[PDB]
Amino acid sequence: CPLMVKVLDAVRGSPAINVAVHVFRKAADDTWEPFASGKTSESGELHGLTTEEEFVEGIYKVEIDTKSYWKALGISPFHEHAEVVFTANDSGPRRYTIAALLSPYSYSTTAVVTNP
Amino acid sequence: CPLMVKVLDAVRGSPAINVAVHVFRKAADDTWEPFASGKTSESGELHGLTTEEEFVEGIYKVEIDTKSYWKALGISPFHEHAEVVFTANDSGPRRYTIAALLSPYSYSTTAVVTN
Amino acid sequence: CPLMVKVLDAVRGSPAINVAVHVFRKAADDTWEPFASGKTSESGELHGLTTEEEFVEGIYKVEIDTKSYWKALGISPFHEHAEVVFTANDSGPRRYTIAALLSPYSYSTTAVVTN
Amino acid sequence: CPLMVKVLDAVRGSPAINVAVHVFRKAADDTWEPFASGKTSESGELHGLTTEEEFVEGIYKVEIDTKSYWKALGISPFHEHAEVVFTANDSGPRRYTIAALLSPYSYSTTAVVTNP
Ligand SMILES: Oc1c(I)cc(-c2nc3cccc(Cl)c3o2)cc1I
Ligand SMILES: Oc1c(I)cc(-c2nc3cccc(Cl)c3o2)cc1I
């Protein structure tokens, strides 16, 4: 699995479950093309977005639908979404974990990048 | 001043100076139109981006050019930029400060919304 | 003013007001001796804790009473407090700002060290 | 496993390996008593600190030796350590993950708390 996402909730001290995530890849014509999407599991994790073959070099955007998450919990949050934009596989194939820690008016994100 | 940005460096423990910041407002066709930009000051702050009259309700995006900042420091970054996207609302407090704390492979952002 | 503290609330998007803050300096016997304290202001800031003459090199601890803050808001917190422990050094910049961004089950802290 | 720690490095985008961690429990006499210690693995994780039987209610301090970590990487960091202090098992037994994301002049921490 070369691209996985993990989302945590800093209010409840839990995984952030059922969070929608959309991944896009920047095209030759400089638009964002749909790449993959899914929702986080009970563990806050989203696996199985892509494959090593399909996940070629490029600029990727991971959009995490944080606003829907908070509204379902009764909270009107600040952000529309959290977006993580990065170049992938520029130094050969890597495995990427995109982590995000959510609060109503804040988020933090980090990457864990490993060499297969 | 209804919209301020503050950028800090978690590696050096300092303001993040000379970081380019672009603000966009979402148009009716759902594209992003340029709205304001500047470079952070010696204190990591960017003031004067807009005015109360111009900063009407809507969806805005603040894009912070983190990659160029790290590159200037000789350090390999992960992200192309940090994007903060939010709705401006007239119901709440009048002043938005968008703060970002930068590391090469990570950033944290918060909003401080006051009167 | 060589030591400032700023505390922000990641739930409300605001300064964290009326948060108790205690500073301690590590003694030769390795116990913590009280040094300064106060409550954050309406802007989430606490100034005037010490002076340049008093703030000599050594190990200091800044304890932020996060639990009482959340309790006052009716929200169950995880931590008893947030502790920031560091060495003050004369070689570097003169002004330390300890910033903390608070959530019920999480906090982030950074140092901004300037002239 | 009722108490585990995970440490990540926000400079390198990797686990924080070989990080020393000391856990203390507040005694009846209000001192900090040693409870358990270990080091993070290649995955940035520390498991096996304690057992469900031993991990009774109390106030616990997890001290993560961040300064040694950064100095080994050639960096002179701000903090002496990162300390996470919390009451455990007050609403019955729980499993706790203490996560920390490290930078030279900053850290973030969160808890993931689950009911067995
Ligand atoms: O004036 C200030 C403002 I506004 C914000 C910060 C701040 N400290 C942070 C620590 C972690 C994450 C984030 Cl976003 C943070 O923002 C500090 C100062 I000084
Ligand atoms: O398995 C994981 C666990 I548990 C925690 C995180 C985590 N990502 C963070 C980003 C910012 C701040 C903090 Cl404390 C974070 O904690 C990541 C993974 I992968």
Side-chain angles (χ1 to χ4, degrees), chain A, chain B residues 1-93 95-115, chain C residues 1-93 95-115, chain D:
Chain A
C1 196
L3 179 59
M4 62 220 108
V5 181
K6 184 166 184 168
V7 191
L8 294 181
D9 179 325
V11 172
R12 294 140 63 91
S14 65
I17 295 163
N18 295 325
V19 178
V21 179
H22 294 257
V23 188
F24 307 85
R25 184 180 176 280
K26 200 193 273 218
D29 82 321
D30 276 321
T31 70
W32 295 108
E33 288 190 326
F35 184 79
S37 68
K39 280 190 190 189
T40 62
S41 71
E42 293 170 66
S43 67
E45 297 182 5
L46 173 50
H47 295 277
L49 286 161
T50 191
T51 63
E52 298 179 320
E53 268 197 355
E54 176 183 75
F55 188 49
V56 293
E57 294 191 73
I59 302 176
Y60 298 80
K61 173 166 67 170
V62 174
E63 176 198 286
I64 302 169
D65 297 335
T66 60
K67 183 177 184 180
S68 294
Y69 179 79
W70 289 119
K71 284 180 75 172
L73 295 173
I75 290 150
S76 301
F78 187 73
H79 300 94
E80 293 294 304
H81 43 60
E83 292 176 308
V84 179
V85 183
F86 64 104
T87 302
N89 309 305
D90 193 58
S91 298
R94 297 291 184 278
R95 302 194 195 293
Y96 301 84
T97 303
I98 306 305
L101 177 64
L102 307 186
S103 303
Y105 278 65
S106 183
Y107 63 91
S108 299
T109 190
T110 198
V112 186
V113 184
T114 71
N115 192 337
Chain B
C1 192
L3 180 63
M4 301 179 9
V5 181
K6 184 165 188 172
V7 190
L8 298 175
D9 174 338
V11 171
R12 301 172 47 107
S14 65
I17 307 167
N18 275 313
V19 178
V21 179
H22 295 257
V23 187
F24 304 88
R25 184 185 188 254
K26 201 176 183 178
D29 69 7
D30 292 331
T31 59
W32 294 106
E33 62 175 55
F35 179 79
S37 59
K39 295 271 228 162
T40 58
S41 74
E42 290 299 310
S43 65
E45 292 178 28
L46 176 57
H47 301 266
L49 278 162
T50 190
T51 64
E52 284 193 330
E53 271 229 73
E54 187 48 30
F55 190 50
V56 300
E57 295 188 294
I59 300 176
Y60 293 84
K61 178 168 62 170
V62 175
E63 178 184 84
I64 303 172
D65 185 3
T66 61
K67 186 181 192 183
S68 296
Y69 179 74
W70 296 114
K71 279 173 64 167
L73 290 170
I75 298 168
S76 292
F78 182 70
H79 303 92
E80 285 297 301
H81 49 248
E83 284 165 320
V84 178
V85 182
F86 63 95
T87 302
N89 203 289
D90 279 355
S91 320
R95 317 216 329 156
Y96 297 28
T97 301
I98 307 300
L101 177 63
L102 310 181
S103 301
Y105 274 56
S106 182
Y107 62 90
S108 183
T109 188
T110 199
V112 183
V113 183
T114 60
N115 281 316
Chain C
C1 192
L3 180 63
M4 301 179 9
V5 181
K6 184 165 188 172
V7 190
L8 298 175
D9 174 338
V11 171
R12 301 172 47 107
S14 65
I17 307 167
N18 275 313
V19 178
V21 179
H22 295 257
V23 187
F24 304 88
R25 184 185 188 254
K26 201 176 183 178
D29 69 7
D30 292 331
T31 59
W32 294 106
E33 62 175 55
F35 179 79
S37 59
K39 295 271 228 162
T40 58
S41 74
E42 290 299 310
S43 65
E45 292 178 28
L46 176 57
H47 301 266
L49 278 162
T50 190
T51 64
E52 284 193 330
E53 271 229 73
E54 187 48 30
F55 190 50
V56 300
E57 295 188 294
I59 300 176
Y60 293 84
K61 178 168 62 170
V62 175
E63 178 184 84
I64 303 172
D65 185 3
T66 61
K67 186 181 192 183
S68 296
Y69 179 74
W70 296 114
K71 279 173 64 167
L73 290 170
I75 298 168
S76 292
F78 182 70
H79 303 92
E80 285 297 301
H81 49 248
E83 284 165 320
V84 178
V85 182
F86 63 95
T87 302
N89 203 289
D90 279 355
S91 320
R95 317 216 329 156
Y96 297 28
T97 301
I98 307 300
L101 177 63
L102 310 181
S103 301
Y105 274 56
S106 182
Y107 62 90
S108 183
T109 188
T110 199
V112 183
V113 183
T114 60
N115 281 316
Chain D
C1 196
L3 179 59
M4 62 220 108
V5 181
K6 184 166 184 168
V7 191
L8 294 181
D9 179 325
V11 172
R12 294 140 63 91
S14 65
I17 295 163
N18 295 325
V19 178
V21 179
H22 294 257
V23 188
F24 307 85
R25 184 180 176 280
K26 200 193 273 218
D29 82 321
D30 276 321
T31 70
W32 295 108
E33 288 190 326
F35 184 79
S37 68
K39 280 190 190 189
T40 62
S41 71
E42 293 170 66
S43 67
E45 297 182 5
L46 173 50
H47 295 277
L49 286 161
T50 191
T51 63
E52 298 179 320
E53 268 197 355
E54 176 183 75
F55 188 49
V56 293
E57 294 191 73
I59 302 176
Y60 298 80
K61 173 166 67 170
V62 174
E63 176 198 286
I64 302 169
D65 297 335
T66 60
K67 183 177 184 180
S68 294
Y69 179 79
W70 289 119
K71 284 180 75 172
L73 295 173
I75 290 150
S76 301
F78 187 73
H79 300 94
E80 293 294 304
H81 43 60
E83 292 176 308
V84 179
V85 183
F86 64 104
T87 302
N89 309 305
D90 193 58
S91 298
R94 297 291 184 278
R95 302 194 195 293
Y96 301 84
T97 303
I98 306 305
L101 177 64
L102 307 186
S103 303
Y105 278 65
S106 183
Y107 63 91
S108 299
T109 190
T110 198
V112 186
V113 184
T114 71
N115 192 337

